[PDB]
From a paper:
The ferredoxin reductase [name] from [name], a member of the oxygenase-coupled NADH-dependent ferredoxin reductase (FNR) family, catalyses electron transfer from NADH to its physiological electron acceptor ferredoxin. It forms part of a putative three-component cytochrome P450 monooxygenase system in [name] comprising CYP222A1 and the [3Fe–4S]-cluster ferredoxin Fdx8 as well as [name]. It mediates the transfer of two electrons from NADH to an iron–sulfur cluster-containing ferredoxin via two successive one-electron transfer steps. The overall structure of [name] is similar to those of other members of the FNR family and is composed of an FAD-binding domain, an NAD-binding domain and a C-terminal domain.
Here, [name] was overexpressed and purified and its crystal structure was determined at 1.9 Å resolution. [name] crystallized in space group P4132, with one monomer in the asymmetric unit. The resulting electron-density map allowed the identification of the FAD molecule bound to the reductase. free of 20.0%, displays very good geometry, with no residues located in disallowed regions of the Ramachandran plot. The structure of [name] contains nine α-helices and 25 β-strands, which form three distinct domains: an FAD-binding domain (residues 1–106 and 223–308), an NAD-binding domain (residues 107–222) and a C-terminal domain (residues 309–393). The pyrophosphate moiety of FAD is stabilized by hydrogen bonds between the main-chain amide groups of Ala12 and Leu11 and O1P and between the side-chain NH2 group of Arg119 and O2A, as well as between the Asp260 side chain and the O2P and O3′ atoms of the riboflavin part. Moreover, Arg42 plays an important role in stabilizing the FAD cofactor through the formation of electrostatic interactions and hydrogen bonds with the O1A atom of the pyrophosphate moiety and the O3B atom of the adenosine ribose. The first difference involves the presence or absence of secondary structure in the loop region (residues 51–63 in [name]) of the five ferredoxin reductases. The short and longer helices found in this region in PdR, PuR, ArR and BphA4 correspond to a purely random loop in [name]. In our [name] crystallization experiments we did not attempt to co-crystallize [name] with the nicotinamide cofactor, and hence the structure of [name] presented here does not contain NAD.
Author numbering: 1 to 393
Amino acid sequence: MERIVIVGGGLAASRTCEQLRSRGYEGELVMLCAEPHPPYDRPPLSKAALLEEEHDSTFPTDYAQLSVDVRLGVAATGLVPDARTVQTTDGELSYDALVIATGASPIRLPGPGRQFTVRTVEDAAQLRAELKPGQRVVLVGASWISAEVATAALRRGCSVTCIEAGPAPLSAALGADVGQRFLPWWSEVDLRLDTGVAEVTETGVQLANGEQVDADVVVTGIGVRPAVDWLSGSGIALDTGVVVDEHLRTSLPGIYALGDVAVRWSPRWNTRIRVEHWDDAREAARTLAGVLLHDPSSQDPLPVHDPVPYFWSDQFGHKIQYVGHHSPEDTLVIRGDGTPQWAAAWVDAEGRLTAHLSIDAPRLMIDARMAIAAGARPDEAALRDPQAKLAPP
Ligand SMILES: Cc1cc2nc3c(=O)[nH]c(=O)nc-3n(C[C@H](O)[C@H](O)[C@H](O)COP(=O)(O)OP(=O)(O)OC[C@H]3O[C@@H](n4cnc5c(N)ncnc54)[C@H](O)[C@@H]3O)c2cc1C
């Protein structure tokens, strides 16, 4: 029997298994999971897992009925493409095709003190146990994850401080103009802008000042880095992530990658995109399955993955929807400026809609997503009215 080996045990790995089976794959499937848990969903870790009574985010995938050999507590540590062999913490195994789906790891600060990052079920459970009335929580970075952790900490009675090097919350992701508009949402947080953090100390954090800010709990949310250090020396093309083409093929034949670990050339956006988004990992698994099962005698084209990216965040009681891929070079146009129903659009030098941000208004996002896909060039009157449809029929 042929053998496809999937390295990693999250959304991309689980969904690739389902897709490979639904689309006719009858060979062997082995999944190498570094974690000692069946794959589970991550968006809930900073949401339900902190706040709700029930929060088991394990996927419904039935690996017994899909004849998937799931190997828990086994991490890949090396790759020998010429031998079609992967090295792991539990020994060697060979493959006929290999899928890299190891996700990304949180960036952390230096220092000796206790420092939480949100990536596993253990992280969320131990962080939840520390979010209690009378606790001082310091969040490093005014990021999506920090905003979500801040929400849960406030609801559980914590004092929250958030230290951001940039000029406004979410400035790294959305820019200073848009981020500045979210300040009222942070009104219950001790938010310190334009402030760098040097390290996590035994008693809290130390600012670039050298000044200290005491804390009972420190949570760092300053981004993630693809988990690719095990690929060192394999000769695979890397660029802060595994480089794949629009068909999720790496630089080496028979080896594929998708999800948070992957950096993908996008014909649409004319650059490499490193978008750690739930929807992008999930959608890529369907494309990847189609690529792997492409009958060689068939003359059909090879499936492509180049969607308009989508991301959401649940914070401060609201729902933020973001679609597209804007550059700092793009022009920001606020929709409904001066009204509570405002949204944000970005257009390029040719007037083409590149991205759109809405709040509690998915109808606006859905229309914007199709407008971006179509390359729509809405006029100023349409952009300034939040309710105006931007997509062609
Ligand atoms: C707290 C949190 C909240 C989020 N909220 C949102 C949200 O609201 N909306 C949104 O769109 N996105 C959200 N995301 C992003 C989204 O969850 C990710 O894009 C998605 O999980 C990526 O799936 P993946 O399978 O590529 O990676 P992961 O889900 O990270 O899976 C990778 C798995 O492989 C394992 N692994 C790592 N190294 C190895 C190795 N060497 N060998 C074997 N296994 C290994 C990891 O332990 C992990 O189990 C959030 C992410 C986090 C962390």
